[PDB]
Design a protein that fits this description.
This protein is an alpha+beta fold. The protein is built from eight helices and 14 strands. An eight-stranded mixed sheet has the order 6-5-1-2-3-7-9-8, covered by helices on one side. A four-stranded antiparallel sheet has the order 11-10-13-14, with no helix packed on it. The structure holds zinc ion. The PDB classes it as toxin.
């Protein structure tokens, strides 16, 4: 049986109000599946996180629009089993296990109250969960995997903002929503080693596509995201960090080090908010004080802990910013991947990673004991054409 995903959810499965539920994104309800503590999956196209982006009608170099995708319960059960299977694959790694744990730990901070002495949740770091008796109760979560909006292949990580606070960047953190599909993959290129096998089309293992957005999710959960302002003469610092590898030192070790001490200080600001705290709204004040100490790897002192172990911050901060990277995950999955984010994808492939004969948790497309095992022939869209239907812009 499983390990990350508690049970095997079918979309047919009956609402129970706890892990199978109709919810409201903080509008009409959607069935949602709590695959793991703090992590839900919504197998719908995302019409909800954007008040403007409330449609799927076509209006970016590579794009793909189909208003009907993720419409049938047959699609939604598959979408769910895909994300599930992709969750298991990423968790099957020492890297993916550690990052999912940082993500489950990374509970968004209680910086909600105008009141300086008071801890309160921020409304947006919740969903409203309709309990079978036909009533709604707010539940905190860290992560939502949701299906895409109009552009099917527009994968991202977003979060409800604060009227004053930069939640993903002040250390607080915020509930994270990933528009993601295990139902599509993009083509990239590399001509192997056999010096040159011309211009072939390999497919991205969508476990990498998912890993990418989780690393963003982890960044934004620990409120250590880099301002999307910060770019390369034009590519996001946050993306270059997230991709990692040869790209990673395009970001100067100058801003690398100011970014680090800026977050150290926003951690200390957070450790003072707790100590100064004398009240709580809605769990125990101390229980909730100890979840954030667990989160920010806080210390011990009988007067009232307070201290940030600058040595322990360093190990968390780097784990999140410099080890949790797309490149490192590529070495673990042992797949053919982009050698840079500065790439672009060329083609869009319809895939089905659900049937174990198509894709596994341990090898993805590149199945053991087959031709797909050699030379990443699993990911090669010319050889494994039976697992990739090319589509256009
Ligand atoms: Zn990204």
């Amino acid at each position: 049986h499983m390990q990350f995903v508690n049970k095997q959810f079918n979309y047919k499965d009956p609402v129970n109000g706890v892990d199978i539920a109709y919810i409201k994104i903080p509008m009409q309800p959607v069935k949602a599946f709590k695959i793991h503590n703090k992590i839900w999956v919504i197998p719908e196209r995302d019409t909800f996180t954007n008040p403007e982006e409330g449609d799927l009608n076509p209006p970016v170099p590579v794009s793909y629009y189909d208003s009907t995708y993720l419409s049938t319960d047959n699609e939604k059960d598959n979408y769910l089993k895909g994300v599930t299977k992709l969750f298991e694959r990423i968790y099957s790694t020492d890297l993916g296990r550690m990052l999912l744990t940082s993500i489950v730990r990374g509970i968004p901070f209680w910086g909600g109250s105008t009141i300086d002495t008071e801890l309160k949740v921020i409304d947006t770091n919740c969903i409203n969960v309709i309990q079978p008796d036909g009533s709604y109760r707010s539940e905190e979560l860290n992560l939502v995997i949701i299906g895409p909006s109009a552009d099917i292949i527009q994968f991202e990580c977003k979060s409800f903002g604060h009227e004053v606070l930069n939640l993903t960047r002040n250390g607080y953190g915020s509930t994270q929503y990933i528009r993601f599909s295990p139902d599509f993959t993009f083509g990239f290129e590399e001509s192997l080693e056999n010096p040159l096998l011309g211009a072939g089309k390999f497919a991205t293992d969508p476990a990498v596509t998912l890993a990418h957005e989780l690393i963003h999710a982890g960044h934004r959960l620990y409120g250590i995201a880099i301002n999307p302002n910060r770019v390369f003469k034009e590519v996001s610092f946050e993306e270059l960090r997230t991709f990692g590898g040869h790209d990673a030192k395009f970001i100067d070790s100058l801003q690398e080090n100011e970014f680090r001490l800026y977050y150290y200080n926003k951690f200390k600001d957070i450790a003072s908010t707790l100590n100064k705290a004398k009240s709580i709204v809605g769990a125990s004040l101390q229980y909730m004080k100890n979840v954030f100490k667990e989160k920010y790897l806080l210390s011990e002192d009988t007067s009232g802990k307070f201290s940030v172990d600058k040595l322990k911050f360093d190990k968390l901060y780097k784990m999140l910013t410099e080890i949790y990277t797309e490149d490192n995950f590529v070495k673990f999955f042992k797949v053919l991947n982009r050698k840079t984010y500065l790439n672009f994808d060329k083609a869009v492939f319809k895939i089905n990673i659900v049937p174990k004969v198509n894709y596994t948790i341990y090898d993805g497309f590149n199945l053991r004991n087959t031709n797909l095992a050699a030379n990443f022939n699993g990911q090669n869209t010319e050889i494994n054409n039976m697992n990739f239907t090319k589509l256009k812009n």
